[model samples]
Target: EDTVEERVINEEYKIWKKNTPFLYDLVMTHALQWPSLTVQWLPEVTKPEGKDYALHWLVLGTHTSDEQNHLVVARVHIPNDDGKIECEIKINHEGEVNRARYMPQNPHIIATKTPSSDVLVFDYTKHPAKPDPSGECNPDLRLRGHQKEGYGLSWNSNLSGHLLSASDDHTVCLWDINAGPGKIVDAKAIFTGHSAVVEDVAWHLLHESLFGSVADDQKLMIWDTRSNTTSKPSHLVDAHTAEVNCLSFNPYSEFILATGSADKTVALWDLRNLKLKLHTFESHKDEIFQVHWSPHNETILASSGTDRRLNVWDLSKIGEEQSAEDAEDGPPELLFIHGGHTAKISDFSWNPNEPWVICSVSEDNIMQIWQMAENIYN
Candidate 1:
């Protein structure tokens, strides 16, 4: 049984490899020593004074069974035809990281979710370049409140030092990193509503006080910190048929949001009316793990899942007519399907500075940075 599965995967790989020249403009892959459950592109890109390529940083985490786990920072040179990616920093972490995200205001500051209830915050610039020989290096700051480990973590883009995290304990915690001078910070408020594990959280792009979260309970909750009662969600919707794994607010449109679910569907929503879904995208054959709205394009979004596919979508093309052959393939909104990974994609991120460029990591210990041919997206 396993042999058959392996053969099919290898066959798909051969076909994808043969078509890479025609399907992608640039594709760079690096095999890591261990698997990473999370990946994020740093906001800033710098060009060396005399070098031909620009420098990009990627935030990742290591999941090691016996060895020391770590929060890693990788330095990648853009237009990297030679496929050379460097590990710029590795700070030993306490446990396997479930997710990792960089502060929007300060990319040097990163927040990571471990297998424990605690959320680790790091100031990479201050940490030692090498892993601690003692096995674990202390994080610069810690956010403690959740009763169980979680995968949900987000930093408020509009509010500096303000962050949100969700957990298996069925609670979402609000944190103020700037609150008083201390290494261990208690959550300012714990928002309780989801009866199941809160899988992901996203801050509203234009609203500093508003945020949204999805959970295993198949509920979508919108919370307002400025509300009269801060513990309850302002609006709650039965968002999906199965566990909701991830949610993303449209970066350009304040009212639009997207959610990926274990039901193998991606739902689009309008914040103005939570009672109804705007649209549903069903392209992935397996559970959807993550979804992200492109920062460069208002109508473009991307999602990845256990099916080993990363699909790019264009909301603007939702109602367009398609040919008989195109209709058989998928929906009109489905612009591209990136079939690069052979294993489940754990996490992926869009390049903030480069339009249509993406970096994704899978459970197979492969980190791929790819850009589709301009003709595909343009």
Candidate 2:
């Protein structure tokens, strides 16, 4: 059975790689020039504003040699109409930052996490912000509580006041960040049940009652926030062969989820039938670190790994013949392979409005933009 599965997936990979439009050519790649430099993954792009201007947040790290090395934020703006990027404005960061994300409601506000168990909010309204003499900036808001460092944060999709963060302390804290008029914000709910660190967390795009979290425990668990204080997971599934590092929901489907694992595979799940995974892609030669469902297409997804390749997968046809519960299809086809990053590909994001545009970053201190062929742009 194992040999059959591998042969099936390899054959489908070839078919998809040749015919699918996910194939992309590198449009441009550049180093984020910063002092004592390193580049973190999951660089994010804002929902294009006014159909013209969009913002991007890039996390900057430094060499271990500089004990005082400060984390930095490269605030970038791009004109989506023309697809030309403007210069970046670097902002000083206080903690050894792990990840940063922009608030959908207030695009100027960015939340950053650090290895010191704190999350700091920076107001890009105050541009050209520089670090203090101690090598960090005075953030507009500083939030602290977890006993260990945090590497993941998820902002509520349609709600403005709520923010969710996962930590190595085995807790996921939900905060009411809308405290008005000089009031300090704090966690509204703390959910604790993971046996190990929670690797990532995400809110349901359309409902607050449901959210999902993946962890080092190799489980993808769903919770209902409205239940009792000691609420148990509504559903749980062993998602991967090894530690599940990341997960994302499909933008167009309410019941689909994708997870990346340390076992060098990405699995697609249909929530309608949690007992079985719908598909699995095993093209990466190393641990898969991140998985993302494109915001613009329901059947398209991407994963990046330590193999230094960015893979795009097409799943439009897999479940067409039967219900998700009984479909016996193998993994979806590997649509494209992007190879240019000389080091591990940490994370990537698809443009919300432009299905053909993608941006990815690596530990090698570089960022690359990939675009579909010009003939497909329309």
lDDT of each: 0.91, 0.69
Per-residue CA lDDT of model 1 for 215-334, tens digit only, reads 999999999999877567999999999999999998777899999999999999998898889999988999998999998999999999899999999988898999999999999999
Model 1 misplacement above 4 A? 80-82
The candidate scoring highest on TM-score is 1
TM-scores vs. true structure, each candidate: 0.97, 0.78
Q: Per-prediction count of colliding residue pairs?
A: 0, 0
Where model 2 places Cα greater than 4 Å from the true spot, the runs are 1-26, 34-87, 127-134, 180-184, 317-332, 372-378
lDDT of 2 by residue, 204-248 (tens): 887767788888899998888887863468888998878888888
